Design a protein around this nucleic acid. Sequence first.
RNA 1: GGUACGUACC
RNA 2: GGUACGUACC
Length: 661
Amino acid sequence: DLTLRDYQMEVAKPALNGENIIICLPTGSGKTRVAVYITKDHLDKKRKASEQGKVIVLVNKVPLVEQHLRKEFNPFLKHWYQVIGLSGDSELKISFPEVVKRYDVIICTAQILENSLLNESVRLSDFSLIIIDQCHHTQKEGVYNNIMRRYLKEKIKNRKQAKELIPQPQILGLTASPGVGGARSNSKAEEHILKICANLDACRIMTVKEHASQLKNQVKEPFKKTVIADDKRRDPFRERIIEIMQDIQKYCQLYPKSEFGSQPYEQWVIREERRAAKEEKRKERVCAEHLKKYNDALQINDTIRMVDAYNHLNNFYKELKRRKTAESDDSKQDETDEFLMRLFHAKKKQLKELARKPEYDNEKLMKLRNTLMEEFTKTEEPRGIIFTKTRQSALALYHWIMDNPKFEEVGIKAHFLIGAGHNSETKPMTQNEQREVIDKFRGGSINLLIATTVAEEGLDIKECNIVIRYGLVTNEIAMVQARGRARADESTYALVASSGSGAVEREDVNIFRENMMYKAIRRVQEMPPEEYLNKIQDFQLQSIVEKQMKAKRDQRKKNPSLITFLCKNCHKLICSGEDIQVIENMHHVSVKKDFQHLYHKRENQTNVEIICKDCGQVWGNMMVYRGLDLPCLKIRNFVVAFEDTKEIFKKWGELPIIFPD
RNA sequence: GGUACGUACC
RNA sequence: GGUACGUACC
Ligand SMILES: Nc1ncnc2c1ncn2[C@@H]1O[C@H](COP(=O)(O)OP(=O)(O)O)[C@@H](O)[C@H]1O
Ligand SMILES: [Mg+2]
Ligand SMILES: [Zn+2]
């Protein structure tokens, strides 16, 4: 039966009376249950007053649509009202305009509403209540704020029709922590709180205060630790890679103004690779390309075990053999290419055997081991999460746990959890694969997640006894969310990091920022109504101006026979701009009748690459379309030469040219 | 593919 | 504003 707790009621009270508010409840409090109570109460009143009651619940992830239906929204509203969940994933055969007419409570991803609002029609007047789950994203150019700026534009247009009366929905913001917006001062922290209040049109932000004793007993915070590693072990792997990197730099004559295995080095060598590609300096760019891989190995050794650093290099040269070697069904090896390959093969014997000695592994891995061992022996049936930065680190830590049988002995049974986006070097986990791992984690089949930021917000994950942030420090919101996953009995939160990395210091800034947030919320709540209304109006007014400036900026092509495509590695003439066409208005393809002569095919739409004939540089991959084998060219791999200038682009849209169908 | 947000570094 | 890492939505 649908009932609230006393702290839940306290916070819900103004939204039941018909006021726009933001609800701030910690993780595990039941903010989604408060939403269901407010939606029924809102709709039950509209029945008794003989009026059109309609709710729309907006969420930031597709899994949350399914999730809010099963657990909360259907059980209490299905028999009494028409309820539905939507997303871009679900291929529905009804238009969203019609889905509005037919249903009382619509749970969906926020972009589905905006798609309809943009262009029978949909307007925000059609809904009487709008609930925005995870409402701290109602900011900048996000989907929530684009929905809300229409509401504010209608609010201003409504006062014009008072003087010369279009209806407007109630608004409910739901979140754990609103954030401070990277503010380093209490003034800027308060400014950010008022801005998201102004974005959601909240007449008051709401927190548990009177019944704060009940909330503290309901959700119990973990014990916070900070496991620092000074890293005063000898590192012969780092030293031996540096010697290789130093040898390569003397060959190509490219010297840095920065330390080896650092981020400013990574930026430098990519810029140097891009310069050397533009200026037809094959020697320099190939050395810069290889130097980046040796630079990756150093920073891989800094986070995960050095066997991974070896494999990153070892796989790179394995793929170079595949591309450079002339297979059947078809020299590529330059002096520079032969020099770099010999250099690896010479020092490959040592690096492989040096990597097998765990005395020279990273110290953070020993700290991670110690933290895992003592905490998984602590309880009968434990559960935990290791937050790491990269996808590679997540997979590599999963192998480290598996290739070390004392974790299997003690109780741990691990599995990685990563994103589904396709803009990384590491492969993605699909949304269905993500769903299956979190289910097994809850069931007990899986014991320990090694996740990226995928695991921190929104998704329903089982209560953890331990959550470790293995080197990862993001922002104040994500810190509270990661700490919020630890809510089992005798739970602990931990930050395993190197003192040299500066992550320990950046966490203390987030702790400082989290304190400013609670002070700021208090000050905005205590603020008198006239002072509040003035400030909320000012931010609402300048928020509209902000979009007009970006709209005019975005409002700011030529002719396709102006350009030609050179191979970035070897500078050979390949295509004119007239040869290009687009498929589905996204994937670009070359048409030229005698294009087959200039490339070869290798395995790793299709799993068949396209590489240069003369030099073995990747151009892209093949694809089937209407029973025709067509070559998909990725813009990354080409130097575009103009008639008037030579430049490289990362995306096809960055060109000042439109192409045919 | 497009777009959004987060973080570090310039 | 740029480079990368990360996550997401259509
Ligand atoms: N008033 C209540 N009475 C009984 N159970 C509740 C109440 N509020 C919440 N719950 C339960 O507690 C859980 C809340 O979890 P969740 O919705 O994930 O919280 P949040 O969204 O704040 O993280 C749900 O499983 C729900 O069944
Ligand atoms: Mg919930
Ligand atoms: Zn080439």
